[PDB]
């Protein structure tokens, strides 16, 4: 029963262990090890649930351990105690494992594998928390146990790459805890968690390890957004050391989404829009990527309305996420038609909906944006239009009032009109004809610059894989 | 303190003096890491509009890189691969000298194509170098 | 929670309120680095002000915020200026951030000054505080029981005094065979790493004297030195030792090595 | 358990690693060299074609 | 400069075409190098037999 | 004593408060040491925290109510972030709705929309429907009138906020200035001239002398009883030419061609 | 037999641990640059061989 | 030294600018040429995934390559217009 199940589960894990072991003990190739751990994870998650929950413990005893076993045991008690067929003579063998070393080699005590196995053993602790989807003991106990040990390592290249993935789970369960219940201790523990990430950002920079650097940065910016401090995040991105060196594209997609929120509300929509388009592109497109895709498409459209642009109607209808983009089809319409009355009425319904996705903040300022669009229509239809005529269409209180509103807009240079107060009309001043100005030279500077960027990038990357392949044996 | 003499020898317009300029770098900075030495020979080998001066500068390169005799095949791979007969002739001689002192298999791997090369004096240079 | 209130009390003036606020910040310095990165010139002013005993605290708070950012040059300038609680960093693994820089910054400056004059150990251009960091790090190096560390960092800045001191104190025949092993390793390192003649020659002259000074050493190491430098006054001196000591077996062997190895 | 020394790595850094560091300076020099050599075959490429 | 811009884009496609084509080669080469490891076993077994 | 400040506040003399402010700050060291400053709260420290809260808050309110503007500004600004994070998520006081309102009001008198949103966003989580907008609608509608460009409605709001005058009067003077300024920067791009009647009506000046005084400061000349925005246009233009930044920024035609050439030659 | 959880060299290694990243750091700096140059050198090699 | 010189009109000609009637004509021809060779290149990538590189070279006209032909055409025109804009701008600033 217990022995048959636990050995069979362990045997499938041992195969996975030998894959990681060879890379980390012969010195890593950065790009290829990072990718293998991602695949590893998916198999391991299923294996822990399957064939008892004490297999993880049984595996620990069998493989060399300096004292790692006691960490797994405490964890076992929370999920209901088991310790049978997980002790020596049912859970020990030194032979055929170079990940414990031979019987003769253990006795000499001139061999060392306690290190590298401990780092991965922590993955199991972190997975077991995730598989269960339980909290309580597991949130605080895993956070406590694992972290002094990453600070007990001197922090090597091989070892930092591995421990980067332990952080995700510590963050996610803290946040999940914080949301579930209200106590002041949760606020208290929030500060100590942030500080630990900041400490660890500095150490891994010395060592030039990229996976760790990126990871901490991403988790901590989300924490600033949820509390609503722009100030802390804006100081944190101006430190400016975010790595693109040895990262994944998902990581890049994550980072860009945070920059868009900060930049949009600091009233710089141009650059917020340019990041959010890139965030979507850099991100993979799949149904396990559906949150990201859904929320980045929602946010992007809110950014265009803030500009004064209208997102395409076709964007919303041909999206297969059209059900949740029901509020946004409505707002894009309300702003286009310029009705004040329609904009108020729509936000009143979907107040809650907008509050979820953190697009309600954008909508308060879209109240201003109604007026602006409505007079953009007026500028394009009519070039000379008396003050009264504008007031009748748009139901504006006085001739003086509408002049103040047009002044604000033409200061920012959107409507590009000029008022004649004395002469009692507003005269559109836009007519373009700008191939006669020197402005097309400046447009051409960017396009050549853009093309240049790719011409460097291909070149550097292309020769890089080829080197290894010639260096290595071939058939 | 030969850096002054070297300047004048490569600035000469006689093919003889640039050839002997190459061994002036060779012998002045021999067995010793100098930035001036390695960079200048490498420049002379390629850029010149005479063929003897190319040949010589390569032989000179292994004299500068005497002590570091395992790094010579990396650099001179390009010079083995060359389109210039004389470039290739000096490459074989360079391994010849550099790795002379004790076996180095990597060098041989380089010189195996040069043995079979269809330029005649490339053959003559590779046949010799191998045995040293 | 935030560092905002603490910063608020500095701007208010009353000595005792500033001083507590300075210590408060300094507890949380790497914990709330972010929000003290905008208002850091405000601490700088407190360091300029002269009626504080917490002036040294003020520049400590500055050094830390800078290293964290990664601005090691602003970080060093105030690191050396605090002159307080810099010694603990030389006991911290996670804060050799600034200590590594100090050592590397020293090596940078020293090598230019040796070349202007060989003696410069009485000069003040390398700061006295940098000197005290560096020479403490030397003591720790030779205490770890590898002299390569202590020789090897001094060798870089073209410090020769640091080399002599290290060697004298290995001297006392801890093991006669071991001591000779250390002279051989110094000779090898110096020829290859250091391709400036000036410092290379100086090291090789010093090593010979340590070997002569001790009453017994392997004379293989002595033969190497006299060949590397090519000086004949050192060669007369080596045969003069063996004339007094006598025995033809010992002298000729050394000489037989000399003829192949050396110049005509 | 175990058997490791820290003494050995530090020693290796002063001694052995510095001599590798001379070698990495040479690969820098190689880098420079193959710019002039690339330009040169480009001049010759044109001359051949003519 | 208008005509210069259209030309610059057109090259960006050639240069990216070259990149695509190398990565296909490297893809294949990963598999060929993998095969050598399997193939050794097959070679070793013959010597023992014969 | 800490209790000295309390009784001076209630009496309703605030000048006397400002001389007690450095002495009671020496004593606040001791109060600070009896609290964990929000990082190790316990039910022992919660009791001490409540006691410390009362001192902190009536000192912020006292400074605004000190009747001179100079006195308001220097001390209220220092105090502003001081209570911000000696109160956990702003507050367990009842003074909270007024004080938080005052935090927002202040920023708009200083004309920083970027900082106003950054501050508003933090507050925004804990005030939303948990305090609603009751007096907090005063700074937000005020922002909303200026962003639309409706400076007429922003003008009126302030006037009606002074029929409910408490301690709002320290900002209304500053906030009347913000409106007349913004209309003046905008209308440089909107007019070429106005008579003296018409420039008064548009930017809301109150007195004839105010019409000409605001002209010297925004550097418009008056010629024949008329203000000219065109002159400001030119004045802006001369400053651009005194840039040493402008050769490389605008870019000479000769630099651009060189720029393109050399990328290839790399 | 052997041990090292007792610290070999008689807890000299312990002392050594504090100053240990000063030595590694300088080397980590150089190596980062070395990775970029190794491929840059191959890159112009490749191109050069085409010519 | 005597051979290299061929007067002072060697260098004067670098400043000398042709008829702009000619430039427009050259640039016109080249624009059309790249479309017509892009189509030729479109045929190259029609599929081009069948075995052996040599059989593809003959079949899809990889001999006398359309990719190489596009590349040369673009570069001659790109660089020429670079010098023409530069010499024009030189002329403007220098004379007046």
Curated annotation (Swiss-Prot), chain B:
- Spans of the PC repeats are 20-55, 56-88, 90-124
Q: Report what the Swiss-Prot or TrEMBL entry states about this protein's PTMs.
A: N-acetylated by NAT1.
More info = Present with 4750 molecules/cell in log phase SD medium.
Write out the similarity annotation. Belongs to the proteasome subunit S1 family.
What functional role does this protein have? Acts as a regulatory subunit of the 26S proteasome which is involved in the ATP-dependent degradation of ubiquitinated proteins.
Q: How does it assemble?
A: Interacts with UBR1.
Name of this protein: 26S proteasome regulatory subunit RPN2
Q: Which organism is it from?
A: Saccharomyces cerevisiae (strain ATCC 204508 / S288c)
Tell me the organism's taxonomic lineage.
Answer: Eukaryota, Fungi, Dikarya, Ascomycota, Saccharomycotina
> Which portion of the entire protein is included?
531 to 662 of 945
UniProtKB/Swiss-Prot annotation, chain D:
Task: List locations, semicolon-separated.
Answer: Cytoplasm; Nucleus
Signal peptide residues are: none
Post-translational note: N-acetylated by NAT3.
Origin superkingdom: Eukaryota
Residues spanning the membrane? none
Function statement: The 26S proteasome is involved in the ATP-dependent degradation of ubiquitinated proteins. The regulatory (or ATPase) complex confers ATP dependency and substrate specificity to the 26S complex.
Q: Which family does it belong to?
A: Belongs to the AAA ATPase family.
Q: What is this protein called?
A: 26S proteasome regulatory subunit 6B homolog
Organism of origin? Saccharomyces cerevisiae (strain ATCC 204508 / S288c) (Baker's yeast)
State the encoding gene.
RPT3
Full-protein residues shown: 35 to 84 of 428
Swiss-Prot record, chain E:
Q: How is it modified after translation?
A: N-acetylated by NAT1.
Question: Could you tell me the superkingdom of the organism this chain comes from?
Answer: Eukaryota
Remarks, anything else? Answer: Present with 19800 molecules/cell in log phase SD medium.
The family classification in the record reads:
Belongs to the peptidase M67A family.
> What job does this protein perform?
Acts as a regulatory subunit of the 26S proteasome which is involved in the ATP-dependent degradation of ubiquitinated proteins.
The entry's protein name is 26S proteasome regulatory subunit RPN8
Q: Which organism is it from?
A: Saccharomyces cerevisiae (strain ATCC 204508 / S288c)
Tell me the part of the parent protein that is shown. Answer: 255 to 304 of 338
Swiss-Prot record, chain F:
List the keywords (alphabetical). Proteasome
Q: Which organism is it from?
A: Saccharomyces cerevisiae (strain ATCC 204508 / S288c) (Baker's yeast)
| Record PANTHER family | 26S PROTEASOME NON-ATPASE REGULATORY SUBUNIT 8
GO BP annotations of the record are:
proteasome-mediated ubiquitin-dependent protein catabolic process; ubiquitin-dependent protein catabolic process
Record's miscellaneous remark: Present with 9890 molecules/cell in log phase SD medium.
Question: What name appears for this protein in its UniProt entry?
Answer: 26S proteasome regulatory subunit RPN12
The organism sits in which domain of life?
Eukaryota
Domain PCI: from-to ranges = 70-245
- Gene of this entry: RPN12
Q: State its role.
A: Acts as a regulatory subunit of the 26S proteasome which is involved in the ATP-dependent degradation of ubiquitinated proteins. Necessary for activation of the CDC28 kinase.
Similarity field: Belongs to the proteasome subunit S14 family.
Task: Identify the Pfam families for this entry.
Answer: CSN8_PSD8_EIF3K
The record's Gene Ontology cellular component field reads: nucleus; proteasome complex; proteasome regulatory particle, lid subcomplex; proteasome storage granule
């Amino acid at each position: 029963l217990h022995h048959s199940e636990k050995k069979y589960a362990e045997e499938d894990q041992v195969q996975e262990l030998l894959k990681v072991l060879n890379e980390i003990s012969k010195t890593t190739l950065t790009l290829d090890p990072r990718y293998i751990w991602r695949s590893l994870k998916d198999l391991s998650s299923l294996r822990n649930q399957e064939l008892l929950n004490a297999e993880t413990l049984c595996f620990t005893v069998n493989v060399l351990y300096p004292d790692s076993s006691s960490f797994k045991k405490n964890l076992l008690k929370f999920i209901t105690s088991n310790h049978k067929s997980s002790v020596p003579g049912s859970a020990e063998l030194r032979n055929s494992y170079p990940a414990s070393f031979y019987s003769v080699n253990t006795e000499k005590k001139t061999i060392e594998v306690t290190a590298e196995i401990n780092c991965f053993m922590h993955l199991l602790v972190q997975l077991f928390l995730w598989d269960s989807k339980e909290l309580e003991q597991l949130v605080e106990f895993n956070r406590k146990v694992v972290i002094p040990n990453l600070l007990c390592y001197y922090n090597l290249r091989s070892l930092n790459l591995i421990n980067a993935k332990l952080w995700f789970y510590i963050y996610l369960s803290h946040e999940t805890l914080a949301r579930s219940s209200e106590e002041i201790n949760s606020d208290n523990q929030n500060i100590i968690l942030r500080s630990t990430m900041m400490k660890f950002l500095k150490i891994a920079s010395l060592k030039h390890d990229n996976e760790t650097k990126a990871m901490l940065i991403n988790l901590i910016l989300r924490d600033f957004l949820n509390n609503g401090e722009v100030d802390s995040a804006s100081d944190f991105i101006s430190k400016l050391e975010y790595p693109h060196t040895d990262v994944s594209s998902s990581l890049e997609a994550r980072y860009f989404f945070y920059l868009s929120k900060i930049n949009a509300i600091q009233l710089d929509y141009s650059t917020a829009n340019e990041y959010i388009i890139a965030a979507i592109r850099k991100a993979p497109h799949n149904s396990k990527s559906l949150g990201f895709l859904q929320q980045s498409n929602k946010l992007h459209c809110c950014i265009q309305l803030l500009m004064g642009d209208i997102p395409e109607l076709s964007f919303f209808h041909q999206s297969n996420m059209q059900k949740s983009l029901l509020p946004y089809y409505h707002l894009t319409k309300a702003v286009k038609l310029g009705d004040l009355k329609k904009f108020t009425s729509t936000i009143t319904k979907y107040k809650q909906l907008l509050l979820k996705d953190d697009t309600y903040q954008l909508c308060v300022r879209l109240r201003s944006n109604v007026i602006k669009t409505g007079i953009r229509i007026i500028s394009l239809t009519y070039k000379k239009i008396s003050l009264r005529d504008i007031c009748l269409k748009l139901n504006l209180d006085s001739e003086q009032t509408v002049e103040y509103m047009v002044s604000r807009a033409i200061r920012d240079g959107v409507i590009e009109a000029k008022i004649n107060h004395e002469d009692g009309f507003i005269e559109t001043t836009e007519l373009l004809n700008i191939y006669d100005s020197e402005d097309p030279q400046q447009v051409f500077d960017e396009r050549i610059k853009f093309a240049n960027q790719l011409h460097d990038e291909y070149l550097v990357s292309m020769r890089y894989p080829e080197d290894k392949k010639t260096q290595q044996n071939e058939k | 303190l030969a850096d002054d003499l070297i300047t004048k020898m490569l600035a000469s317009d006689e093919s003889l003096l640039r050839y002997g300029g190459a061994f002036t770098i060779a012998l002045a900075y021999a067995g010793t890491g100098n930035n001036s030495a390695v960079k200048r020979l490498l420049h002379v080998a390629v850029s010149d509009s005479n063929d003897d001066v190319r040949r010589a500068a390569v032989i000179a390169l292994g004299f500068v890189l005497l002590r570091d005799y395992t790094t010579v095949p990396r650099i001179v791979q390009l010079l083995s691969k060359s389109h210039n007969a004389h470039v290739r002739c000096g490459t074989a001689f360079a391994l010849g000298i550099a790795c002379a002192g004790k076996g180095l298999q990597s060098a041989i791997d380089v010189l195996d194509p040069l043995t079979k090369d269809p330029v005649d004096f490339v053959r003559q240079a590779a046949m010799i170098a191998l045995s040293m | 929670t935030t560092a905002a209130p603490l910063l608020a009390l500095l701007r208010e003036n009353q000595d005792s309120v500033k001083t507590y606020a300075l210590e408060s910040i300094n507890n949380v310095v790497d914990q709330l680095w972010s929000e003290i990165s905008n208002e850091l010139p405000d601490i700088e002013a407190l360091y300029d002000d002269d009626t504080f005993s917490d002036r040294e605290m003020a520049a400590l708070i500055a050094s830390k915020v800078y290293y964290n950012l990664g601005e090691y040059e602003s970080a060093v300038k105030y690191a050396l200026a605090a002159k307080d609680r810099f010694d603990i960093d030389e006991k911290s693994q996670f804060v050799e951030t600034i200590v590594s820089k100090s050592i590397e910054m020293y090596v940078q400056e020293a090598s230019k000054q040796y070349t202007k004059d060989e003696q410069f150990y009485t000069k003040d251009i390398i700061d006295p505080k940098l000197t005290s960091i560096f020479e403490r790090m030397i003591e720790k190096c030779l205490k770890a029981s590898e002299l390569k560390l202590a020789l090897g960092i001094a060798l870089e800045g073209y410090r020769l005094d640091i080399i002599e001191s290290a060697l004298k104190s290995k001297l006392d025949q801890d093991s006669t065979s071991e001591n000779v092993k250390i002279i051989n390793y110094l000779l090898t390192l110096a020829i290859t790493t250091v391709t400036n003649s000036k410092f290379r020659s100086s090291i090789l002259r010093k090593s010979f004297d340590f070997l002569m000074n001790m009453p017994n050493c392997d004379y293989l190491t002595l033969n190497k030195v006299v060949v590397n430098l090519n000086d004949a006054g050192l060669a007369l001196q080596l045969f003069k030792k063996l004339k007094e000591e006598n025995d033809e077996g010992l002298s000729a062997q050394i000489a037989f090595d000399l003829v192949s190895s050396a110049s005509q | 358990n175990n058997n490791s020394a820290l003494s050995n790595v530090n020693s290796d850094i002063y001694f052995k690693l510095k001599k590798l560091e001379k070698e990495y300076e040479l690969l820098t020099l190689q880098e420079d060299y193959i710019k002039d050599e690339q330009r040169h075959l480009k001049r010759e490429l044109k001359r051949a074609q003519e | 400069i208008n005509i210069s811009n259209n030309l610059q884009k057109a090259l960006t496609v050639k240069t990216n075409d070259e990149l695509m084509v190398i990565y296909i080669s490297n893809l294949v080469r990963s598999i060929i190098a993998f095969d050598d490891l399997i193939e050794n076993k097959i070679q070793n077994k013959k010597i023992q037999e014969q | 004593l800490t209790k000295s400040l309390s009784i001076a506040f209630e009496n309703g003399d605030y000048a006397a408060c400002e001389k007690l402010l450095p002495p009671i700050k020496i004593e606040l060291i001791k109060n600070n040491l009896l609290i964990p400053d929000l990082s190790i709260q316990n039910d022992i420290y919660l009791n001490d925290l409540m006691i410390t809260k009362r001192i902190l808050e009536v000192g912020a309110l006292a400074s605004i109510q000190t009747f001179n503007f100079d006195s308001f500004e220097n001390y209220f600004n220092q105090l502003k972030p001081y209570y911000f994070s000696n109160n956990h998520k702003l507050s367990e006081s009842d003074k909270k709705s007024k004080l938080i309102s005052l935090y927002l009001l202040n920023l708009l008198s200083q004309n920083n929309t970027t900082k106003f949103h950054s501050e508003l966003q933090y507050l925004d989580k804990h005030i939303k429907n948990l305090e609603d907008d009751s007096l907090l609608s005063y700074p937000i509608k005020l922002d909303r009138w200026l962003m639309e460009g409706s400076y007429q409605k922003a003008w009126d709001l302030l006037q009606s906020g002074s029929q409910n005058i408490s301690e709002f009067d320290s900002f209304t003077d500053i906030l009347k200035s913000a409106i007349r300024d913004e209309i003046a920067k905008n209308t440089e791009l909107s007019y070429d001239f106005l008579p003296l009647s018409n420039i008064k009506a548009l930017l809301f000046f109150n007195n004839e002398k105010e019409t000409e005084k605001f002209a010297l400061e925004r550097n418009w000349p008056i010629v024949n009883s008329k203000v000219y925005f065109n002159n400001q246009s030119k004045e802006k233009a001369d400053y651009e030419d005194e840039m040493m930044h402008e050769e490389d920024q605008k870019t000479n035609i000769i630099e651009k061609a060189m720029d393109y050439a050399i990328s290839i030659e790399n | 037999m052997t041990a090292a959880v007792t610290s070999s060299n008689i807890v000299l290694e312990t002392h050594e641990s504090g100053i240990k990243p000063y030595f590694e750091q300088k080397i980590q700096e150089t190596e980062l640059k070395i990775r970029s140059k190794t491929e840059n050198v191959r890159r112009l090699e490749a191109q050069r061989n085409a010519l | 030294k005597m051979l290299m010189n061929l007067h002072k009109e060697q260098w004067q000609s670098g400043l000398k600018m042709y008829d702009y009637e000619e430039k427009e004509e050259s640039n016109l021809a080249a624009t059309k040429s790249m479309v017509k060779i892009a189509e030729q290149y479109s045929k190259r990538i029609e599929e081009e995934k069948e075995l052996t590189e040599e059989e593809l070279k003959t079949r899809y006209v990889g001999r006398q390559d359309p990719k190489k032909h596009l590349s040369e055409t673009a570069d001659e025109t790109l660089e020429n217009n670079i010098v023409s804009v530069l010499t024009a701008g030189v002329n403007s600033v220098a004379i007046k």
